[PDB]
Amino acid sequence: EVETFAFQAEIAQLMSLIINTFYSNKEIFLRELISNSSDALDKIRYESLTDPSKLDSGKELHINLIPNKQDRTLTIVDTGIGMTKADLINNLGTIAKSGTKAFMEALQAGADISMIGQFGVGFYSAYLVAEKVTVITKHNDDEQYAWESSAGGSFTVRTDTGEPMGRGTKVILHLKEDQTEYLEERRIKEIVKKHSQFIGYPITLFVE
Ligand SMILES: [Mg+2]
Protein backbone atom coordinates (compact mmCIF):
# COMPACT_ATOMS: atom_id res chain seq x y z
CA GLU A 1 0.00 0.00 0.00
CA VAL A 2 1.68 3.18 -1.30
CA GLU A 3 0.38 6.58 -0.13
CA THR A 4 0.92 9.69 -2.29
CA PHE A 5 1.32 13.15 -0.76
CA ALA A 6 1.61 16.67 -2.15
CA PHE A 7 4.63 18.69 -1.07
CA GLN A 8 3.76 22.01 0.46
CA ALA A 9 3.89 24.60 -2.31
CA GLU A 10 6.99 26.25 -0.84
CA ILE A 11 8.93 22.96 -0.82
CA ALA A 12 7.85 22.11 -4.38
CA GLN A 13 9.14 25.56 -5.39
CA LEU A 14 12.51 24.92 -3.72
CA MET A 15 12.85 21.59 -5.52
CA SER A 16 12.05 23.27 -8.84
CA LEU A 17 14.64 25.98 -8.23
CA ILE A 18 17.31 23.37 -7.50
CA ILE A 19 16.40 21.37 -10.60
CA ASN A 20 16.13 24.30 -13.01
CA THR A 21 18.80 26.81 -11.97
CA PHE A 22 22.03 26.66 -13.95
CA TYR A 23 24.62 25.80 -11.27
CA SER A 24 27.77 23.88 -12.17
CA ASN A 25 29.04 23.20 -8.61
CA LYS A 26 26.73 20.22 -8.14
CA GLU A 27 29.20 18.35 -5.87
CA ILE A 28 27.98 20.19 -2.74
CA PHE A 29 25.10 17.70 -2.48
CA LEU A 30 27.36 15.16 -0.77
CA ARG A 31 28.54 17.45 2.05
CA GLU A 32 24.89 18.34 2.78
CA LEU A 33 23.81 14.70 3.06
CA ILE A 34 26.85 13.76 5.16
CA SER A 35 26.14 16.78 7.38
CA ASN A 36 22.55 15.61 7.79
CA SER A 37 23.84 12.17 8.76
CA SER A 38 26.26 13.66 11.30
CA ASP A 39 23.44 15.69 12.89
CA ALA A 40 21.22 12.59 13.13
CA LEU A 41 24.07 10.74 14.83
CA ASP A 42 24.58 13.63 17.30
CA LYS A 43 20.85 13.45 17.98
CA ILE A 44 20.68 9.78 18.88
CA ARG A 45 23.82 10.24 20.95
CA TYR A 46 22.43 13.00 23.17
CA GLU A 47 18.94 11.51 23.39
CA SER A 48 20.49 8.28 24.66
CA LEU A 49 22.21 10.06 27.56
CA THR A 50 18.89 10.38 29.41
CA ASP A 51 17.58 7.08 27.98
CA PRO A 52 20.25 4.41 27.32
CA SER A 53 17.51 2.10 26.03
CA LYS A 54 17.39 4.13 22.79
CA LEU A 55 20.66 2.40 21.81
CA ASP A 56 19.16 -1.12 21.95
CA SER A 57 18.58 -0.71 18.18
CA GLY A 58 22.34 -0.40 17.61
CA LYS A 59 25.30 1.16 19.39
CA GLU A 60 27.56 1.89 16.40
CA LEU A 61 27.45 5.47 15.07
CA HIS A 62 28.91 5.77 11.57
CA ILE A 63 28.28 6.67 7.92
CA ASN A 64 28.66 4.50 4.80
CA LEU A 65 28.92 5.78 1.23
CA ILE A 66 27.93 2.98 -1.16
CA PRO A 67 28.18 3.43 -4.95
CA ASN A 68 26.55 0.91 -7.30
CA LYS A 69 27.28 1.37 -11.00
CA GLN A 70 24.90 -1.45 -11.95
CA ASP A 71 21.95 0.33 -10.28
CA ARG A 72 23.40 3.81 -10.91
CA THR A 73 22.84 4.70 -7.24
CA LEU A 74 24.87 6.42 -4.53
CA THR A 75 23.60 5.56 -1.04
CA ILE A 76 24.43 7.58 2.10
CA VAL A 77 23.75 5.30 5.08
CA ASP A 78 23.83 6.36 8.73
CA THR A 79 22.90 4.77 12.07
CA GLY A 80 21.49 8.05 13.39
CA ILE A 81 18.14 8.85 14.98
CA GLY A 82 16.13 8.05 11.85
CA MET A 83 12.72 9.50 11.05
CA THR A 84 9.15 8.62 12.07
CA LYS A 85 6.22 8.39 9.69
CA ALA A 86 4.88 11.55 11.36
CA ASP A 87 8.21 13.19 10.48
CA LEU A 88 8.06 12.07 6.84
CA ILE A 89 4.50 13.32 6.24
CA ASN A 90 4.19 16.40 8.48
CA ASN A 91 7.01 17.45 10.82
CA LEU A 92 9.78 17.67 8.22
CA GLY A 93 7.71 19.94 5.98
CA THR A 94 6.66 22.05 8.97
CA ILE A 95 10.28 22.83 9.87
CA ALA A 96 11.44 23.02 6.25
CA LYS A 97 8.87 25.67 5.31
CA SER A 98 10.53 28.40 7.39
CA GLY A 99 14.08 27.46 6.36
CA THR A 100 13.02 27.39 2.71
CA LYS A 101 11.73 30.97 2.90
CA ALA A 102 14.98 32.26 4.45
CA PHE A 103 17.04 30.44 1.81
CA MET A 104 15.09 31.99 -1.05
CA GLU A 105 15.26 35.33 0.73
CA ALA A 106 19.04 35.15 0.65
CA LEU A 107 19.21 33.74 -2.90
CA GLN A 108 18.07 37.19 -4.08
CA ALA A 109 19.69 39.02 -1.11
CA GLY A 110 23.33 37.88 -1.00
CA ALA A 111 23.67 34.12 -1.51
CA ASP A 112 24.11 31.16 -3.84
CA ILE A 113 22.95 27.53 -3.72
CA SER A 114 26.00 26.41 -1.72
CA MET A 115 24.67 27.87 1.55
CA ILE A 116 21.42 25.83 1.44
CA GLY A 117 22.63 23.89 4.49
CA GLN A 118 22.64 26.94 6.75
CA PHE A 119 18.83 26.93 6.50
CA GLY A 120 18.17 23.26 7.32
CA VAL A 121 17.01 22.19 3.84
CA GLY A 122 20.28 20.91 2.39
CA PHE A 123 18.66 17.52 1.74
CA TYR A 124 16.94 18.90 -1.35
CA SER A 125 20.35 19.60 -2.88
CA ALA A 126 20.19 15.88 -3.73
CA TYR A 127 18.15 16.89 -6.79
CA LEU A 128 21.20 18.59 -8.26
CA VAL A 129 22.37 15.11 -9.23
CA ALA A 130 19.48 12.68 -8.64
CA GLU A 131 16.43 12.21 -10.85
CA LYS A 132 14.76 10.24 -8.03
CA VAL A 133 15.55 10.02 -4.31
CA THR A 134 14.55 7.06 -2.13
CA VAL A 135 14.93 7.35 1.65
CA ILE A 136 14.75 4.26 3.88
CA THR A 137 14.47 5.19 7.52
CA LYS A 138 13.87 3.53 10.89
CA HIS A 139 13.25 5.40 14.17
CA ASN A 140 12.85 3.80 17.59
CA ASP A 141 9.22 3.02 18.50
CA ASP A 142 8.16 3.30 14.83
CA GLU A 143 8.40 1.03 11.82
CA GLN A 144 10.75 1.16 8.83
CA TYR A 145 9.49 3.32 5.96
CA ALA A 146 10.42 4.04 2.36
CA TRP A 147 9.90 7.65 1.22
CA GLU A 148 10.34 8.41 -2.45
CA SER A 149 10.14 11.38 -4.78
CA SER A 150 11.11 12.31 -8.32
CA ALA A 151 9.95 15.89 -7.57
CA GLY A 152 7.03 17.04 -9.71
CA GLY A 153 5.19 18.11 -6.57
CA SER A 154 4.56 14.78 -4.89
CA PHE A 155 6.18 12.08 -2.76
CA THR A 156 5.22 8.59 -1.61
CA VAL A 157 5.51 6.77 1.72
CA ARG A 158 5.16 3.03 2.27
CA THR A 159 6.12 0.56 4.96
CA ASP A 160 9.47 -0.94 3.94
CA THR A 161 9.56 -4.74 3.64
CA GLY A 162 13.19 -4.80 2.48
CA GLU A 163 16.27 -5.47 4.60
CA PRO A 164 15.52 -4.34 8.20
CA MET A 165 17.86 -1.61 9.46
CA GLY A 166 17.72 -1.55 13.25
CA ARG A 167 17.94 2.27 13.35
CA GLY A 168 19.09 4.97 10.92
CA THR A 169 18.54 6.36 7.44
CA LYS A 170 19.56 5.43 3.90
CA VAL A 171 19.39 8.13 1.22
CA ILE A 172 19.46 6.37 -2.17
CA LEU A 173 20.36 8.79 -4.99
CA HIS A 174 19.19 7.51 -8.40
CA LEU A 175 21.66 9.57 -10.39
CA LYS A 176 20.84 11.44 -13.57
CA GLU A 177 22.39 10.04 -16.74
CA ASP A 178 25.12 12.70 -16.96
CA GLN A 179 26.06 12.52 -13.24
CA THR A 180 27.70 9.09 -12.95
CA GLU A 181 30.99 10.73 -11.94
CA TYR A 182 29.67 10.51 -8.35
CA LEU A 183 29.95 6.73 -8.61
CA GLU A 184 33.72 6.98 -9.12
CA GLU A 185 35.96 6.37 -6.13
CA ARG A 186 38.49 9.10 -6.90
CA ARG A 187 35.68 11.64 -7.28
CA ILE A 188 33.87 10.70 -4.06
CA LYS A 189 37.19 10.69 -2.18
CA GLU A 190 38.12 14.11 -3.54
CA ILE A 191 34.75 15.55 -2.49
CA VAL A 192 34.80 14.07 1.01
CA LYS A 193 38.35 15.36 1.57
CA LYS A 194 37.47 18.85 0.30
CA HIS A 195 34.18 19.40 2.17
CA SER A 196 33.67 16.70 4.83
CA GLN A 197 37.10 16.10 6.37
CA PHE A 198 36.34 16.84 10.05
CA ILE A 199 33.11 14.90 10.58
CA GLY A 200 33.18 13.36 14.05
CA TYR A 201 32.10 9.86 12.94
CA PRO A 202 33.67 7.18 10.71
CA ILE A 203 32.80 7.54 7.01
CA THR A 204 33.47 4.34 5.03
CA LEU A 205 33.57 4.68 1.24
CA PHE A 206 32.64 1.26 -0.14
CA VAL A 207 34.44 0.31 -3.32
CA GLU A 208 32.72 -0.70 -6.63
MG1 LIG B 1 6.15 19.35 2.32
Domain boundaries, the chain: 3-199
Euclidean distance between CA atoms 188 and 193, whole angstroms: 9
What method did the depositors use to determine the structure? X-ray
* Residue 25 one-letter amino acid: N
**Alpha carbon of 208 to ligand 1 centroid (Å):** 34
**Alpha carbon of 164 to ligand 1 centroid (Å):** 26
**Alpha carbon of 162 to ligand 1 centroid (Å):** 25
**Alpha carbon of 159 to ligand 1 centroid (Å):** 19
Residue 62 near residue 201 (C-beta atoms within 8 A): yes
Residue 129 near residue 182 (C-beta atoms within 8 A): yes
Q: Which residues are annotated as a binding site?
A: 36, 78, 97, 123
**Alpha carbon of 97 to ligand 1 centroid (Å):** 7
Residue 16 near residue 154 (C-beta atoms within 8 A): no
**Cβ atoms within 10 A of the Cβ of 92, count?**
18
Of 3.40.50.720, 2.60.120.10, 1.10.287.610, 3.30.565.10, which CATH number belongs to 3-199? Answer: 3.30.565.10
DSSP code, position 7: P
Euclidean distance between CA atoms 110 and 43, whole angstroms: 31
**Alpha carbon of 93 to ligand 1 centroid (Å):** 4
Using CB atoms within 10 Å of the CB of residue 83, give its burial: 0 to 12 exposed, 13 to 18 middle, 19+ buried.
buried
Resolution for the entry shown, Å = 2.0
**Alpha carbon of 11 to ligand 1 centroid (Å):** 6
Q: How many helices (H) and strands (E) does the chain have?
A: 5, 8
Look at residues 82, 68, 100, 96 and name the one whose alpha carbon lies nearest to residue 173.
68
**Alpha carbon of 25 to ligand 1 centroid (Å):** 26
Q: Which residues are annotated as a binding site for ATP?
A: 36, 78, 97, 123
**Alpha carbon of 120 to ligand 1 centroid (Å):** 14
DSSP code, position 2: -
Using CB atoms within 10 Å of the CB of residue 103, give its burial: 0 to 12 exposed, 13 to 18 middle, 19+ buried.
buried
